[PDB]
Amino acid sequence: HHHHHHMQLSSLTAVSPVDGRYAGKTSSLRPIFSEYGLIRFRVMVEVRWLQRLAAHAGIPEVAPFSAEANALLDSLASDFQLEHAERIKEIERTTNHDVKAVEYLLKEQAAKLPELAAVSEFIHFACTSEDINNLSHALMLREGRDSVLLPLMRQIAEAIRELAVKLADVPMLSRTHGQPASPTTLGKELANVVYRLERQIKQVAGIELLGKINGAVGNYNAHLSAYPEVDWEANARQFIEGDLGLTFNPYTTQIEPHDYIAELFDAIARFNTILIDFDRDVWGYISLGYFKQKTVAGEIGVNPIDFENSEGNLGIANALFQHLASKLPISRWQRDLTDSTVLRNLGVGIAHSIIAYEASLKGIGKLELNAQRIAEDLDACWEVLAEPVQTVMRRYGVENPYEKLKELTRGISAEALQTFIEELAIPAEAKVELKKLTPAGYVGNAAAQAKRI
Amino acid sequence: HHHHHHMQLSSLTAVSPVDGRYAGKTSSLRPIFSEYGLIRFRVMVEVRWLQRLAAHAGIPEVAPFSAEANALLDSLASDFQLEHAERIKEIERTTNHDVKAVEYLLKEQAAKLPELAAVSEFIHFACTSEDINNLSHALMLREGRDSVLLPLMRQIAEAIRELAVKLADVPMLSRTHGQPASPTTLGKELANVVYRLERQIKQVAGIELLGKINGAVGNYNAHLSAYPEVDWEANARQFIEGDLGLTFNPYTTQIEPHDYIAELFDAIARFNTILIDFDRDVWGYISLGYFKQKTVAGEIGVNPIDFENSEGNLGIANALFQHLASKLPISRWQRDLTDSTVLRNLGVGIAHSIIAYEASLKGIGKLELNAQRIAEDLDACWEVLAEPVQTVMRRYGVENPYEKLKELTRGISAEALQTFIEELAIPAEAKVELKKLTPAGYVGNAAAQAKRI
Amino acid sequence: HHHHHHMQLSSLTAVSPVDGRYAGKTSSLRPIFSEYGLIRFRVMVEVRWLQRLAAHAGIPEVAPFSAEANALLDSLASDFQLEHAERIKEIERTTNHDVKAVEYLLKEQAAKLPELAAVSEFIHFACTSEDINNLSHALMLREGRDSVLLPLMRQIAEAIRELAVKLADVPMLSRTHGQPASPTTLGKELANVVYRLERQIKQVAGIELLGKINGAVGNYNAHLSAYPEVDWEANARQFIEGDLGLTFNPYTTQIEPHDYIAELFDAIARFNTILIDFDRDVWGYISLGYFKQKTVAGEIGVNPIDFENSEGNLGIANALFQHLASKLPISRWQRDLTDSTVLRNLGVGIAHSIIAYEASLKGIGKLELNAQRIAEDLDACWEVLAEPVQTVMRRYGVENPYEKLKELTRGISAEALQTFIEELAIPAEAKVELKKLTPAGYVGNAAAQAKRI
Amino acid sequence: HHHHHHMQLSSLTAVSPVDGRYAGKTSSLRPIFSEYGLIRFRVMVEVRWLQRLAAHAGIPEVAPFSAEANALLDSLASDFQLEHAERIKEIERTTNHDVKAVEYLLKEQAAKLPELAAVSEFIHFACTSEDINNLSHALMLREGRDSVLLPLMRQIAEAIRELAVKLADVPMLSRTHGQPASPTTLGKELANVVYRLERQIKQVAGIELLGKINGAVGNYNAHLSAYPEVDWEANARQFIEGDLGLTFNPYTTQIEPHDYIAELFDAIARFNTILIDFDRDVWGYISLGYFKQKTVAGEIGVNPIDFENSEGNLGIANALFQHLASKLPISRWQRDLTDSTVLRNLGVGIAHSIIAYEASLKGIGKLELNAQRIAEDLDACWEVLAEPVQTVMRRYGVENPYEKLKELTRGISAEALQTFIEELAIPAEAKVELKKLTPAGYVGNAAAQAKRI
Numbered sequence A, B, C, D: 001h002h003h004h005h006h007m008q009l010s011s012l013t014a015v016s017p018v019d020g021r022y023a024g025k026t027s028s029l030r031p032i033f034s035e036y037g038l039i040r041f042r043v044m045v046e047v048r049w050l051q052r053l054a055a056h057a058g059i060p061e062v063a064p065f066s067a068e069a070n071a072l073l074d075s076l077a078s079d080f081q082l083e084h085a086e087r088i089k090e091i092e093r094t095t096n097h098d099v100k101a102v103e104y105l106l107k108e109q110a111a112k113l114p115e116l117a118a119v120s121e122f123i124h125f126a127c128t129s130e131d132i133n134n135l136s137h138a139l140m141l142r143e144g145r146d147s148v149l150l151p152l153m154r155q156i157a158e159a160i161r162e163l164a165v166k167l168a169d170v171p172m173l174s175r176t177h178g179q180p181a182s183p184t185t186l187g188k189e190l191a192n193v194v195y196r197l198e199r200q201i202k203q204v205a206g207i208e209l210l211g212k213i214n215g216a217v218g219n220y221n222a223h224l225s226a227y228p229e230v231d232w233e234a235n236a237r238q239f240i241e242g243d244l245g246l247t248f249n250p251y252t253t254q255i256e257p258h259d260y261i262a263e264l265f266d267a268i269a270r271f272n273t274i275l276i277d278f279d280r281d282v283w284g285y286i287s288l289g290y291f292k293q294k295t296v297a298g299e300i301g302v303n304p305i306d307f308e309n310s311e312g313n314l315g316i317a318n319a320l321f322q323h324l325a326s327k328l329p330i331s332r333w334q335r336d337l338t339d340s341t342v343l344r345n346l347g348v349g350i351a352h353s354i355i356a357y358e359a360s361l362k363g364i365g366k367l368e369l370n371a372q373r374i375a376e377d378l379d380a381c382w383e384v385l386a387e388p389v390q391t392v393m394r395r396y397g398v399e400n401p402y403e404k405l406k407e408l409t410r411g412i413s414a415e416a417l418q419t420f421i422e423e424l425a426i427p428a429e430a431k432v433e434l435k436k437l438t439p440a441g442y443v444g445n446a447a448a449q450a451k452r453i
Ligand SMILES: Nc1ncnc2c1ncn2[C@@H]1O[C@H](COP(=O)(O)O)[C@@H](O)[C@H]1O
Pocket: A096, A097, A098, A099, A129, A130, A133, A337, A340, A341, A342, A344, B176, C021, C300, C301, C303, C305, C308, C309
């Protein structure tokens, strides 16, 4: 027992490293995925709902707002104040109901202007709490994806592309099963990663972010009891697609079913898996000495600690993404509430991802070629030239090729190759090209593929 | 120690229930995902490669084949014989190399016709083993997806759609947190599942199945050493997209990187997750007595054992899909061989999925309505009508609504509602509609949504 | 784009709900698992190492400390000041090395007293950073397990035991496959959970928490170069087992290999899995109306939201525990650094666990029996008495039992049973006991088992 | 569409590679975990139950059996015939109930001897199907663990121990973060793995395998209705602990709750995780050329394909173990049947494990030292000797050590070290030892630790 007094929350004392050691890397998510962010977006959705009712000619009891009333509401929806989130937390100490606390805050703000007080009972009109929550979650995911996550993903792809093109012509021994194999270029091996990452970026950006607004159980019961002549399905689709810029989900229960969150998180996890592969392969190239790493003055160790930090955080991110994708879309009957607490972690997998992306970018920026080590391994591996000799022998039908090639590989050297080539019953132009071969020259079209990535 | 003599393999003695208790449900996968299937497709790809070289004007050493030579090759590629797979296994006892054994089998078959013997050294010309493997895996996945998996997925969606439409008008108490909530219809709750499943079917069917053919390390080194003037990238894309009907992957190492396998398995897993949710919710409806189940003469128990079997097998399927998606796309440098053994399990997650799909279809086919139990719970829940009364009161600005509504809910009954409605300062047409309300009538537009699924 | 200004960290703006919405439930972990906690324990281990060297007669250059020198060091190790952790973070901005920053802080504190300044180069003597880290992690896990986690686990077991005993005699219909089955008592069904939880508590408490202190790569190289005559293995075991109260790991690389962290987290996850099962089953009993829940004045809904919050957080906890157990014990060669960032999340799975445990305790405290609903289902299920009638018929060899029992079940009622029993060729004492049977009486020895849990 | 005719089951056509490509490695599991094995053990448990009743003085209606009756029953329980499992499958085509089919088979065998026919209604007396299933599962797991899995685990530990001792004195450069670090010995790095594996072997062997026998819902209801004076709890514990050699679980529902299966599978997974780490590290040593691999005559490639196969199969095994541990112990109320189909896969994770263990043993047996490559890297790394020089300088208080040591490392060589050591204000005996240092000599006590593993 090493007991300790209570400590106030700071980045030093935060239990999770998302808000702790890595707070500086995750702070852009605080307006989005925190409880403040959830409250902010709940208030936005409530305000826009009330404004939609005011504009709706089928809802005469909410008349179109004056500029002054709109200005108050627009300030809540687009210039949200921390003091209101603090008040909502205070109200929640009584209600033990977080969306009801948002409602009460909005009624308190509406009370201050008579035009808004007169329609205060239309705040949240016919809504269930999940009508507000699901639209908040989609807006949070849209903001986190588009303004924080995707820019960093594209930064990684472009930083690796720059190196792929720079290093396109640098021949390098390949390793399969860890053992020497036909050469490539270092730029080609980096280009391969760019191509994979960009496929997943396109998939991440393409996921439709679904929303609904349809009352307690999905069927607009309360809406139709009060306003049987209003087309509430048309209103909902216009609100969600037009007013909010999301994609409409026409069939739900109390909750939006969360399949699109699984789709999005599965796509981010696939990007992260490619980046784990990259972090490990580059750790391996640095272990071989093929890359060296720039140092920063005053720092104390060069070890690839940024790639290692990235790899560790991508694993955590993907574990969380896998859990949320597997668990969120199962909900008992017209819903159970186990998803609410889980959805408070939408930002946590994204946080571990962007921590890793910043770390991978830092590691990439330190990479410098060590051409001497790359060339050392290549020039010590004339054995890679058995394959092209064998393939040319096959083209031209050289007799007893297995025995014949074994005369060379019992082994290969520049001089032994020159001698062996002249023994072969192949045309003169075939000999000219084989005699030019060196390990570093036997790269196929790696460089051309790399340059056009 | 209960020791036992050695047992030959049969469905009774198979260790895995895929080939054991459930062999009858998985037998359509035997020509596809088994070692026989892998061998079958390897032979197909080798044959089509040789035929592509024969047709290629840039490869004059392989002349276009006679009809008789094509007939032999076409028989290997489209009427494959188990005896050849058995011979390949025999050869492999020497080579300890499965694709090399395919090569040797093809050379043995080519030896039988002089036209083919003359080009036997062009079997597998310039290929690495993974050129054959990755195209085999894509063709296997295409066949399993299109001819076995997707038809069963669509059968489930259509069987649930039929019930959704049949039961569209059947009012039912909703349960949120397990507790009574505003009514729906049983058909609407089934329609919700159809909509989710069909989104994932579209995603499953839409995954592009990627292939490559580019030699040892991705760069066509051997091809270009023998045939420097042939456009091998164009040839590869035409082979893969045109001859084989797959999608070209232009950047790979020795292996195709397997991201599209993660994409496909992530999409099947999302379908399976919806079907787990359905299996559990229907188990719950059967527990409530809302559905009864038909019985089969002579069987001994009615318990929802087909839904339970389905739910158990979907969990196994998804565990395997998650592992393969997470692990396959990480491979050391220009590849490690840990993916080979894992890819022998491509069919196993699919097998557990189709076992579950058959079980869910069997359970669905047994479902029959128990309207008495559904109505019993609804008519015992007049409390659901507080919400519409409250919403109408809000529309018309009824004073002190919290206190006023509490006069009714201290509770609600047909008679107490009639009396309470007449107390309200609301228009006559609002009273007419509230006075018609019954729990079973308070379903919103559930039925119309359900009918158009 | 709903852009937002930068926000300082508070529980409202924290991205993770561990330090956000649930900060009040996790604050006891801040002195333990946060970066502050890691720093605190690193300083403790360094101080105790230096004190061990001072006491070691084989290290004459560090003489036993004066009381005044011990007092300074003891204050660092047992009354740690946030200002020192803040200074360490400042130093780390230069070093980019967190344990080196601890070293420099300790050298700054040692400079203030000449007796300590004279041995400042023995701070961290012969250590590698992981000698300090691994002992810190074990001490952190010990404190979190023993002082925070295990007390809450035992609170749950005892709270369920109290209800099991209270409800031991309350007969209840069982449900298997969701369908009626032979009765039990509600207390017996709760007792079953206590027994399972306490097995896992014993396993959690029993995990040995392993430590090492052996230099850069596990072999005491530096120690032996300077002090070849000191038994450094004996010193390490005495330090770890005696001075620190941990268990010695005699074989490591640079890192302690983390298997015991997998053992501990696997055991906590098994407890959590039982508690998920409990949270779901109780949600089901509340859905059946068998339990009602107390309400709190002023709160706004009764729904089992505490059990649902618990269930959601146990799933997150277990996802993190599974990842850390699977990934931490794999480390490249004599180590890679991917474990460091992952180990900053040791407290996060524990945090989600204790959030869930508090929520489950809150839900349990609200539970009250609804005996009317339990009895309603039982008295409507005379069909459960076919089984005992059939078993008695088997004991006494009643002829044609299948046909005979079918005469009764075509069904069972109190009166039909009285009549049927008199038809049976069984002894008088067998009839006496069958005639007493009622559904609520047919509970076996459930009550006696429940009372002794 | 490459359609194909139906294929009968063989190892070539099996969908799962457990019964397919790897059938030869898994065939020892066929009498244990297959449907045959499940049936075999169900028959064993039923027979032993009937024999327990015959011996029970409180069950006078089943008299102690003649030797002839025991011989028939003992043959069913200890010399089980495939023909009976085939008959059970035939009966199951009618019953659609697998344990009821076992009952009917046993009644058919009992009919053949009048002494057994007279007690045929005591076959399965008062049991529920899960009384037979759970005891079967525990006996299956015991047999698979003790007779197949643990022997292979110990074979791996001993094979690595043999190499650890053989290579105990072989100095080797360490790599941390992939970069050079203080030397070790190759035998020490292998010894570290032995120690970890054997901890998990002890845990695997120590798991108690739990059983119950207590009727439909855990409360002996039917037993007590027929035999109210028999102590059925004492009988159950004696049957399970004494007759069957298992451990008693006193609190269950219809099912044994499966926590001990999670405990066992978690322990096997921890062993497998260590073996993945080993497979990867050895793949790395082979990539460095530190080990070479023996070849087999006629085989065609040396690549570490056995370690790669092992690593791939351990990942699959652990994915299945994780799923079964997480899912099996959650069961709705007094049970749902989703566990039945999942438990048919108890042998599948074990199968992938023993495939991997055989592959790792094959790879280990091929390992041979390449002392030239190990020594090449060591003798090229005099930089490892900065650490001991620095530590000796600290012991003796050498002034301005940072600047002083930098005079040497701007670098280190045998000659520069000799010169630098003579500059230091340290005692003569300290210089004698520093002057002896070479990279290969700077291994600490690695060799002594390795030799006593
Ligand atoms: N049906 C519901 N829909 C939305 N929110 C709800 C519902 N029922 C309760 N809540 C509130 O949702 C919040 C859940 O908190 P948590 O479990 O911490 O995510 C609490 O404020 C609950 O009172």
